[PDB]
Scaffold this active site. Structure first.
Site, PDB file in Angstrom:
ATOM      1  N   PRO A   1      32.871  65.644  78.080  1.00 39.86           N
ATOM      2  CA  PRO A   1      34.129  66.113  78.706  1.00 39.86           C
ATOM      3  C   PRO A   1      35.312  65.361  78.143  1.00 39.86           C
ATOM      4  O   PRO A   1      35.226  64.191  77.828  1.00 39.86           O
ATOM      5  CB  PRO A   1      33.938  65.828  80.174  1.00 39.86           C
ATOM      6  CG  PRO A   1      32.470  66.007  80.400  1.00 39.86           C
ATOM      7  CD  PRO A   1      31.824  65.535  79.109  1.00 39.86           C
TER       8      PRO A   1
ATOM      9  N   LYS B   1      27.695  64.129  83.640  1.00 42.52           N
ATOM     10  CA  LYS B   1      27.548  63.755  82.252  1.00 42.52           C
ATOM     11  C   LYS B   1      27.489  62.244  82.170  1.00 42.52           C
ATOM     12  O   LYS B   1      28.086  61.538  82.971  1.00 42.52           O
ATOM     13  CB  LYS B   1      28.718  64.287  81.429  1.00 42.52           C
ATOM     14  CG  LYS B   1      28.845  65.786  81.412  1.00 42.52           C
ATOM     15  CD  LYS B   1      28.326  66.413  80.145  1.00 42.52           C
ATOM     16  CE  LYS B   1      28.646  67.888  80.189  1.00 42.52           C
ATOM     17  NZ  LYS B   1      27.868  68.497  79.140  1.00 42.52           N
TER      18      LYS B   1
ATOM     19  N   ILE C   1      31.455  70.955  77.533  1.00 43.66           N
ATOM     20  CA  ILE C   1      30.360  71.809  77.136  1.00 43.66           C
ATOM     21  C   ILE C   1      29.507  72.046  78.365  1.00 43.66           C
ATOM     22  O   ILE C   1      28.715  71.188  78.796  1.00 43.66           O
ATOM     23  CB  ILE C   1      29.540  71.189  75.997  1.00 43.66           C
ATOM     24  CG1 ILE C   1      30.380  70.945  74.757  1.00 43.66           C
ATOM     25  CG2 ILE C   1      28.326  72.076  75.726  1.00 43.66           C
ATOM     26  CD1 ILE C   1      29.727  70.043  73.727  1.00 43.66           C
TER      27      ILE C   1
ATOM     28  N   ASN D   1      43.852  73.218  83.528  1.00 45.90           N
ATOM     29  CA  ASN D   1      43.165  74.290  82.817  1.00 45.90           C
ATOM     30  C   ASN D   1      41.758  73.856  82.459  1.00 45.90           C
ATOM     31  O   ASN D   1      41.605  72.818  81.813  1.00 45.90           O
ATOM     32  CB  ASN D   1      43.894  74.706  81.553  1.00 45.90           C
ATOM     33  CG  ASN D   1      45.250  75.281  81.819  1.00 45.90           C
ATOM     34  OD1 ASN D   1      46.294  74.662  81.538  1.00 45.90           O
ATOM     35  ND2 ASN D   1      45.280  76.445  82.370  1.00 45.90           N
TER      36      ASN D   1
HETATM   37 ZN   LIG Z   1      43.995  75.314  77.130  1.00 47.86          ZN
END
Ligand SMILES: [Zn+2]
Ligand SMILES: [Zn+2]
Ligand SMILES: [Zn+2]
EC number: 5.3.2.1
Lengths: 114, 114, 114
Positions: free
Chosen positions: A1, A32, A64, A97
């Protein structure tokens, strides 16, 4: 991440230890290993949210996997909580986001994760 | 919607009122209320476009919907027009990446937009 | 194509000629003319990788095409090689996110690439 936070809060208002707190909490929330978590904080920015220059944050989380409706709600509660407590940013002045990356589209260590 | 512009133009060349102008015009173009628009300008960057360091801009627009071929042409005309008029950046030295976000992939106010 | 590198390496540690070298090497790797390559380097950042503030880089490559499993492995070897040689960053402290853009989703010159 990989997590980035862009904010108009000044650098001196980012508390000592904040990157480490982000790393720890993201490792736990995503599942993670901490070794794979990268964090980036960008203070002192020229930004507005709703036309207003009150404290705000614009953020991105790339991962991911581990992205989805319920997971993202959980991350938002965690991250907005941290930004409110540490940076004094209202949760309703934060956008995050979330981007689910394919392993073949993430480079690391001279190759990709595919 | 959220818009970022990264540019090598110096901070002193960003005119007063620019963030408010961006907010207003993006609200109008996307049709979204200005309370939902966030804007971010990053001057003084170390950047090149096509091998040279004349004024340029690299930008991103993230929106939940309101992204598509004709809409994006209209946004580009608007945004390049503003960058040319206000920052004196040639339109042929501007890239804008348009990202259509799913509501479940945008965090805000301790949750997502889903 | 456009490439951004965010790093905690100090500005004075970024060699003269680095933007030009990135431009030339990306033009060669992507096969695109240098006129279409944009590069952006952001030093002195507040970042961590695996909880550590040793030198690191978080990067993005956006391109209309020229993104895929084998191509991305090649770009990663190339770009990690450059960051190791020029910025002294270990390849295992670099992430690169590759984003294949649709032409209609890239603005340029008052319109899009569609
Ligand atoms: Zn973006
Ligand atoms: Zn993008
Ligand atoms: Zn990305």
């Amino acid at each position: 991440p990989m997590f980035i936070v862009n904010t108009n809060v000044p650098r001196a208002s980012v508390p000592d230890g904040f990157l480490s707190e982000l790393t720890q909490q993201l490792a736990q929330a995503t599942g993670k290993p901490p070794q794979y978590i990268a964090v980036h904080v960008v203070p002192d920015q020229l930004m507005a949210f709703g036309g207003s220059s009150e404290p705000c944050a614009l953020c991105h989380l790339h991962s991911i996997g581990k992205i989805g409706g319920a997971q993202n709600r959980s991350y938002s509660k965690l991250l907005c909580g941290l930004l409110a407590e540490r940076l004094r940013i209202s949760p309703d002045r934060v956008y995050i986001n979330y981007h689910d990356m394919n392993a073949a589209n993430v480079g690391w260590n001279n190759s990709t994760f595919a």
